[PDB]
Design a protein around this ligand. Structure first.
Ligand SMILES: *[C@@H]1O[C@H](CO)[C@@H](O)[C@H](O)[C@H]1NC(C)=O
Ligand SMILES: *[C@@H]1O[C@H](CO)[C@@H](O)[C@H](O)[C@H]1NC(C)=O
Ligand SMILES: N[C@@H](CCP(=O)(O)O)C(=O)O
Ligand SMILES: N[C@@H](CCP(=O)(O)O)C(=O)O
Lengths: 442, 433
């Protein structure tokens, strides 16, 4: 079976992009190490810590039903059909278009949903997505953050690039609407990366962006696989230093789009929601091996991809020791999403079963509308010490960290250059730039 | 029951916007006479004709299951779940955003879909919507036709108006893409009508269009209810001779957006896919009464809306005789969608059942992938006499009729001023201002 299934008292659903979308038609392709495995194992980590915890859900064990989405909303729709036939809540998904398609069918069967990565403004709708919630802020605030950064840098002439789907198109739309409403920020052109990219499509996009030579700055709402190929095409056409990249949360502080393409990505300003690196997950993930992690059905494929061998592999390899490892940026949000579900179940248990230590007969079948009420009313400190809470729409506060990709001597890092919390707090003095030429006649 | 269920050998699904979307938290609202009932009854008419026909599907009766979409895609998704868990094929829907959501769930259970009104270019994609087909052409040709009409009339400065959803936004996007490449057409502003509009919204939209008074021409990709309220606000602010209206297929030759607002809609150039009025349906629909049409569950509500009475109503009222009636513009496409399904089942019957006059043991279960091939390869003269065919993508050819709303003395009509078949053919001599 191509699924992770662990039995418990209350079973929680899981949607993760373990594999990236295949090239042209093919549903599933290459494995996602950071975006897939790191986040998937973070849910398993959280559940293990909750079941261990004597205070949170005493004498109660959470179940597991993790399914692969293959970076496709169409593929995730038929996978989400297995949730409805027992599943009490769903953690996920990653991409907004994927979360939207699943939320359309979960609301009819009244199953609460908490996402860890989906940021599309449409998901804030309390009528169309009444059972949807998220521990990440909507793109309404991220677009405003990117407007402020562009204003501070004085780049009044910008181009926009987006991946086909809700996140890319409506994220850029949010940036465009703010530009038209207030300020002197003007948009040169809006390009869209197709969902099924043709051979040589990425080379054509770069050439299309060169049709406005004055527009050096590019606002980018694209997935990590698209960013890598955009930067690859920019290197292929010798456009080093020309484009000034502005990346959203899908870019973040990720190693995937910049791997082996460090020089072309220099000086790129990136956005990511307020998060911290969790030491607890790092200790757990490093201890995971081929021998002890049979629970993860995709871990064998991960082993082959992480160390670069065929199952050639000794089995005595260790993560972070034999290969490069850094915790994925949204690992915190996966853990905080599971805890938000757990605390809500704990709070519902206190009202329905006031005496019994464990699952009582009154809490035999979990009501979807009732559980959702406890999710929205929950208030606790997360896995990083940061408070986790939901508003009237079921969204997280608009809090962001701003990074810049910098190269010094030989080392590369995403240096924290500022943060956006209701208003901008950018340090221009700490920003570094690469050396440049395209003449204009307009 | 809130649906029409007629049992047969092969059951066909139907999705029709009987009611419009509600105002507040309400899902279903006002009953649409033309867009809803006329088209719904056209499917029932088509099925009645096929069952009567001794040549097409001999000794085989087609069943039907028609559901209400209530103009909402989220409501239509709930209804479309009753088709799955037997349905061999689904006919519908009208709106593109509705058809898209339905096509997402039908492909998983391999149920072929033929639409009569949905024109969004996204639906042409063979990877995303592999089981979707349509007897109407995509908006990519309709947007090009609009650019040609705008260029020929000498309207270099234009404004765009779109209803929230796949049809409005992608229809305007396609227009903008062609206008961005060409030099003869330039866009002043792009307005978007909200899906859930607040009070006083339509008057604000008109005021925003008046911010650029040189842009008199307005290209509209809006639904029946949205066009009406746009024209209502324009009449309210006395903007009669100022605006020049360009209407898409959702405007067409319909009377619903222009009812009691004839003066404001004068000289409006509208487009519609090539169609003809069918005499066979008109004879059928005029004979439909409260007494004989118990089949249609919404017909009692339609009767109150059509004649303006309460069940006040005598029952002796007659359609066309007592109330103003004209066949809806897309009635042909509904009928041709059913015949496309019928001929495909007829051609599959010939290959699977050698010489049987009826269902053979091999025709026990209808394979969706196999039926899809017979739908795409179908070739027949339709209900209007015009040929019905599908291409590699599953689309009809980009053939359109161009109309203009003209007023003479007291009479009002949508006069044919030209047609678009890959190239523009506009008759300037038949236009009035
Ligand atoms: C936990 O639950 C089990 C089974 O219901 C029961 O036997 C046990 O006594 C419980 N333990 C505690 C500490 O309440
Ligand atoms: C129609 O089908 C029925 C039942 O299978 C059969 O009895 C009858 O002979 C058929 N009619 C003709 C004209 O073949
Ligand atoms: N907000 C993004 C997901 C961020 P990721 O690429 O998973 O790191 C989306 O909704 O598509
Ligand atoms: N082409 C339109 C439908 C036209 P109608 O308003 O049903 O007459 C759409 O795709 O939404």
């Amino acid at each position: 079976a191509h699924s992770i299934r662990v039995d418990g008292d209350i079973i929680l659903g899981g949607l993760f992009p373990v594999h990236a979308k295949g090239e042209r038609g093919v549903p599933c392709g290459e494995l996602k190490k950071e975006k897939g495995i790191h986040r998937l194992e973070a849910m398993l980590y959280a559940i293990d810590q909750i079941n261990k915890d004597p205070d949170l859900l005493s004498n109660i064990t959470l179940g597991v039903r993790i399914l692969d989405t293959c970076s496709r909303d169409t593929y995730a729709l038929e996978q989400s059909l297995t949730f409805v036939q027992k599943i009490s809540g769903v953690i996920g998904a990653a991409a907004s278009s994927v979360s939207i398609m699943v939320a359309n069918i979960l609301r009819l069967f009244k199953i609460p949903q908490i996402s860890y990565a989906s940021t599309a403004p449409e998901l804030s709708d309390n009528t169309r997505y009444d059972f949807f919630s998220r521990v990440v802020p909507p793109d309404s605030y991220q677009a405003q953050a990117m407007v402020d950064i562009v204003t501070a840098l004085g780049w009044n002439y910008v181009s926009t690039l987006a991946s086909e789907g809700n996140y890319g198109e409506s994220g850029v739309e949010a940036f465009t609407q703010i530009s038209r409403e207030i300020g002197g920020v003007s948009i040169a052109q809006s390009q869209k990366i197709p969902r099924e990219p043709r051979p040589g499509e990425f080379e054509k996009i770069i050439k299309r962006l060169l049709e406005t030579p004055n527009a050096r700055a590019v606002i980018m709402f694209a997935n990590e696989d698209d960013i890598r190929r955009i930067l690859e095409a920019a290197k292929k056409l010798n456009q080093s230093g020309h484009f000034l990249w502005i990346g959203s949360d899908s870019w973040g502080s990720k190693i995937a789009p910049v791997y082996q393409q460090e020089e072309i990505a220099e000086g790129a300003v990136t956005i990511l929601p307020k998060r911290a690196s969790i030491d607890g997950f790092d200790r757990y993930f490093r201890s995971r091996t081929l021998a002890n992690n049979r629970r993860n059905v995709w871990f064998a494929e991960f082993w082959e991809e992480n160390f670069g061998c065929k199952l050639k592999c000794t089995g005595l390899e260790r993560i972070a020791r034999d290969s490069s490892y850094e915790q994925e940026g949204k690992v915190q949000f996966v853990i905080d999403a599971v805890y938000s579900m757990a605390y809500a179940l704990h709070n519902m248990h206190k009202d329905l079963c006031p005496g019994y230590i464990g699952l009582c007969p009154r809490m035999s079948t979990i009501d979807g509308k009732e559980l959702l009420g406890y999710i929205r009313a929950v208030n606790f400190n997360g896995s990083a010490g940061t408070p986790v809470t939901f508003n009237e729409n079921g969204d997280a506060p608009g809090r962001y960290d701003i990074f810049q990709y910098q190269i010094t001597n030989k080392s590369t890092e995403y240096k924290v250059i500022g943060h956006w919390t209701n208003q901008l707090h950018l340090k221009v003095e700490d920003m570094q730039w690469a050396h440049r030429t395209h003449p204009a006649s307009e």
